[PDB]
Amino acid sequence: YQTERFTKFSDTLKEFKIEQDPFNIIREFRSAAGQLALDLANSGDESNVISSKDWELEARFWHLVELLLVFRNADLDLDEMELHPYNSRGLFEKKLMQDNKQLYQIWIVMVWLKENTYVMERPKNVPTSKWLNSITSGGLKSCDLDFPLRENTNVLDVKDKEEDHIFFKYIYELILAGAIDEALEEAKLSDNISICMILCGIQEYLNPVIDTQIANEFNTQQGIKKHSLWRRTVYSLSQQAGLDPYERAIYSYLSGAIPNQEVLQYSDWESDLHIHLNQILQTEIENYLLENNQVGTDELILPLPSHALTVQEVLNRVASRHPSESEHPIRVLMASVILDSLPSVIHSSVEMLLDIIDKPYLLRIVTHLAICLDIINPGSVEEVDKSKLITTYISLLKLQGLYENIPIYATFLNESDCL
Amino acid sequence: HNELIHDAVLDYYGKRLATCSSDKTIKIFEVEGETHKLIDTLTGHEGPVWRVDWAHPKFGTILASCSYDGKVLIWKEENGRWSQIAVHAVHSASVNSVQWAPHEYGPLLLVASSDGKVSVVEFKENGTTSPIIIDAHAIGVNSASWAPATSRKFVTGGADNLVKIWKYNSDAQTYVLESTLEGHSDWVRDVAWSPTVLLRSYLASVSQDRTCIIWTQDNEQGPWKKTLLKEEKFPDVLWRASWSLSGNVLALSGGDNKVTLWKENLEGKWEPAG
Amino acid sequence: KKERHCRLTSWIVSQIGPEIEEKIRNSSNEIEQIFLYLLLNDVVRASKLAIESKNGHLSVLISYLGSNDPRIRDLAELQLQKWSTGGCSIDKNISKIYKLLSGSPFEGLFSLK
Numbered sequence A: 001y002q003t004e005r006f007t008k009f010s011d012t013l014k015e016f017k018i019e020q021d022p023f024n025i026i027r028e029f030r031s032a033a034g035q036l037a038l039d040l041a042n043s044g045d046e047s048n049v050i051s052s053k054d055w056e057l058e059a060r061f062w063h064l065v066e067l068l069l070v071f072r073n074a075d076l077d078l079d080e081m082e083l084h085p086y087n088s089r090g091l092f093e094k095k096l097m098q099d100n101k102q103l104y105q106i107w108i109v110m111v112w113l114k115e116n117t118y119v120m121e122r123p124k125n126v127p128t129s130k131w132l133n134s135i136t137s138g139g140l141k142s143c144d145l146d147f148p149l150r151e152n153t154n155v156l157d158v159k160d161k162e163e164d165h166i167f168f169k170y171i172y173e174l175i176l177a178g179a180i181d182e183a184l185e186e187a188k189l190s191d192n193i194s195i196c197m198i199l200c201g202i203q204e205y206l207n208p209v210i211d212t213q214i215a216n217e218f219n220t221q222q223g224i225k226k227h228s229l230w231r232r233t234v235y236s237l238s239q240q241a242g243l244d245p246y247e248r249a250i251y252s253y254l255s256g257a258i259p260n261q262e263v264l265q266y267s268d269w270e271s272d273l274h275i276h277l278n279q280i281l282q283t284e285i286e287n288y289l290l291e292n293n294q295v296g297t298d299e300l301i302l303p304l305p306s307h308a309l310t311v312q313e314v315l316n317r318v319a320s321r322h323p324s325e326s327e328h329p330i331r332v333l334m335a336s337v338i339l340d341s342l343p344s345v346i347h348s349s350v351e352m353l354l355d356i357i358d359k360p361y362l363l364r365i366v367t368h369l370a371i372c373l374d375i376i377n378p379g380s381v382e383e384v385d386k387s388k389l390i391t392t393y394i395s396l397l398k399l400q401g402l403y404e405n406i407p408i409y410a411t412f413l414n415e416s417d418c419l
Numbered sequence B: 001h002n003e004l005i006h007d008a009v010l011d012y013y014g015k016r017l018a019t020c021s022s023d024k025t026i027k028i029f030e031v032e033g034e035t036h037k038l039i040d041t042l043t044g045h046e047g048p049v050w051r052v053d054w055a056h057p058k059f060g061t062i063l064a065s066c067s068y069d070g071k072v073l074i075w076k077e078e079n080g081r082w083s084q085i086a087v088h089a090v091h092s093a094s095v096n097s098v099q100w101a102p103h104e105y106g107p108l109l110l111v112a113s114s115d116g117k118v119s120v121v122e123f124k125e126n127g128t129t130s131p132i133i134i135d136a137h138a139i140g141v142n143s144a145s146w147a148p149a150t151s152r153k154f155v156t157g158g159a160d161n162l163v164k165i166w167k168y169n170s171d172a173q174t175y176v177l178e179s180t181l182e183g184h185s186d187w188v189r190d191v192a193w194s195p196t197v198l199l200r201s202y203l204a205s206v207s208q209d210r211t212c213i214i215w216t217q218d219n220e221q222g223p224w225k226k227t228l229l230k231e232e233k234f235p236d237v238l239w240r241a242s243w244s245l246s247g248n249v250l251a252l253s254g255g256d257n258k259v260t261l262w263k264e265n266l267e268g269k270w271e272p273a274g
Numbered sequence C: 001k002k003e004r005h006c007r008l009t010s011w012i013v014s015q016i017g018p019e020i021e022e023k024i025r026n027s028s029n030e031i032e033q034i035f036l037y038l039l040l041n042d043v044v045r046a047s048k049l050a051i052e053s054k055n056g057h058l059s060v061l062i063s064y065l066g067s068n069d070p071r072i073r074d075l076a077e078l079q080l081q082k083w084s085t086g087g088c089s090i091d092k093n094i095s096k097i098y099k100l101l102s103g104s105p106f107e108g109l110f111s112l113k
Helices: A006-018 A023-041 A048-073 A089-099 A101-115 A132-137 A158-176 A180-189 A193-200 A227-239 A245-254 A269-291 A311-321 A323-327 A329-338 A342-351 A360-376 A383-399 A403-410 C002-026 C030-039 C043-052 C056-062 C070-083 C092-102
Strands: B005-010 B016-021 B025-030 B037-043 B049-051 B062-067 B072-077 B082-088 B095-100 B109-113 B117-123 B129-135 B141-146 B153-158 B162-167 B176-182 B190-193 B201-206 B212-217 B238-243 B250-254 B259-264 B270-272
Touching: A006 A023, A006 A360, A006 A403, A023 A048, A023 A360, A048 A101, A048 A329, A048 A360, A089 A101, A089 A269, A101 A269, A101 A311, A132 A158, A158 A180, A158 A245, A180 A193, A193 C056, A193 C070, A227 A245, A227 A269, A227 C043, A227 C056, A269 A311, A311 A323, A311 A329, A323 A329, A329 A342, A329 A360, A342 A360, A342 A383, A360 A383, A383 A403, B016 B049, B016 B062, B049 B095, B062 B095, B062 B109, B072 B109, B082 B117, B082 B129, B095 B141, B109 B141, B117 B141, B153 B190, B190 B238, B201 B238, B201 B250, C002 C030, C030 C043, C030 C056, C030 C092, C043 C056, C056 C092, C070 C092
Parallel strands: B005 B049, B141 B190
Antiparallel strands: B005 B016, B016 B025, B025 B037, B049 B062, B062 B072, B072 B082, B095 B109, B109 B117, B117 B129, B141 B153, B153 B162, B162 B176, B190 B201, B201 B212, B238 B250, B250 B259, B259 B270
16 A cells, blocks of 8 residues: 555645644654654565665654744744843853754754664663672772772673673663653662762752742752863763773763764764764853853863854764765755755755656655745745646656645646646 | 994985984984985984984974983974974883874874883874873883774884784774784894785784794784794894885894895795895 | 851861861872862862872762752762661772762761761
């Protein structure tokens, strides 16, 4: 049956033109692609695993589109936040994310990135308690994480290191996926209290009593006041070798830094891009705080880089670092959406019809995207480009023998007359 | 007066020679066939300058020298006037070898001192040094040569008669030892990696016991192959062992006042040439 | 309340200052020094020495001293009970520091009394 696909997308358009909000179209496009992603994936010829991934990718694209256009377009402007110098850093961070839409967009994108991150299954047969092997062998004169750092790592049993590896890797995957609550649960429950505690430093300080404008979200002070310190402390910890590469990786991510080579070598376009947007973000916040004298000089223990990249440049670098992946045609759209250069790319792939015909999803996707765009933002895509796109896709509806559902797509030109 | 120069190096284009002797001075010459005109003398060491070595001209005019005073001194010509721009002496004994990496690696340096250490000194954005050192050999290191490649590696010749092959690792951030090789009965004086991007890799390991073993590895997998160049001790202790770029010729500087030359033949074994 | 608290504690640190600095002068053990820096209510130099003496995890933990995060409090206390029930050996000053993180350093069962 699967050669139904176009129906689903077409179907969604029917429903829209007929209850005469348009963001639902895309939401459905997403779900549609995802549903199809499942079909080709389950039981299939290994020629299908490929086009299955091109559907999952499809789906992620629709999601990213929804998220960003919702934020950008459903922008109806709220009330400005008036801080005082007595206010906590927490509030200033919030203010920053409110006022600077460019940067919040980075947040949105990171959220999307996390959403679609793979995490291993929870490690089984985890041991009763930490470093149990070393303790049992005798030779841990101190039971604290820093003991084998104070003096040769030869202290820790091999099996203990192997388990610490399992743990820190799992925690790392969870952190990259946004699963911070799960990471704290794992830390707690796996007898890694001190690491847990480390994960608690992630929050900026708020006090509901002082920072009135969040006395709703909070009933109790929380987060840590000397955060610039925390951050250097963690970063330095991240640079100290004789720690497991995933642990160092974790601290890197937390300090707004770029994890060690041993770990980073396995990160893909999404993972890598995520890492570097995290860096942009971290740097930008800490700079925002410095420009408002909410950082205390004592805390500038160490040099961290102060110069934030632009999303443009991060993308360019990550691209050159992952050319194969970068060049994949829906991930180009992903980037195009991220930079807003989107009608830009529409008109572009339009002129590539004048090695876009070779891949099937593309001509469809661009067309339905163009439709959505001009629905949500009348004017968005050049009238001509709509004409050209629908023209060509329609002729494929003909080549597929689905003339049945051509009128729906017609509802965008007087050129429709000619059908 | 120059009765005993210990090392000399030629630049990429071979216009400027840099000898270094025992009186601590490093003399720079403008060579032109018969006539090498002395252009400079460089005094900044507290002991015999054992070795000198130009860097890739991609990095301007830089020359890292190592001397008996335990200190590596980086020099640089500046508008026709030399100046010691940096120094790296994190070694508690006489520094023996100093050899730059392939210019694709950055501006990396390879120091090898008698305190059983070998460092790789990066020169950052401020031009300042970024030392990441390793312990190489027990009783001391006489030499350390770089490897070209396209997964970086180098070789080290020891005072415990070992010949070690180290490789970079992003997990460790320090060069992880990957293979050691045993075949000499005395201080491994010099070790050389061959610049031949050919079917196999060649190593000529000269030593004090008047041998020169040649470690020919088949490829990336199968370990090395021991081959005593010739099976008779040379009339005197051997010092230096250098490969040729074009050709894979081997030059051997024995303490017997001539330099011999050995070429591989279709037997796989090595034959004199000259 | 915060203001008053901060002035009182800055003042106490003014008084105990030389006592402790003397004690830091004579210590022969780094972790003990880290503890003493906590005795001068200097979280940052404790964190720094920890970092330097290669005690990095502790260092991170230290950064919590003076945020009253009850999670961290009950976790630190928990770690202490687990040690004080088997725990073949824990360094004498690391336990002191954990006890500080517990929020009840004498009021306790690993007591600084």
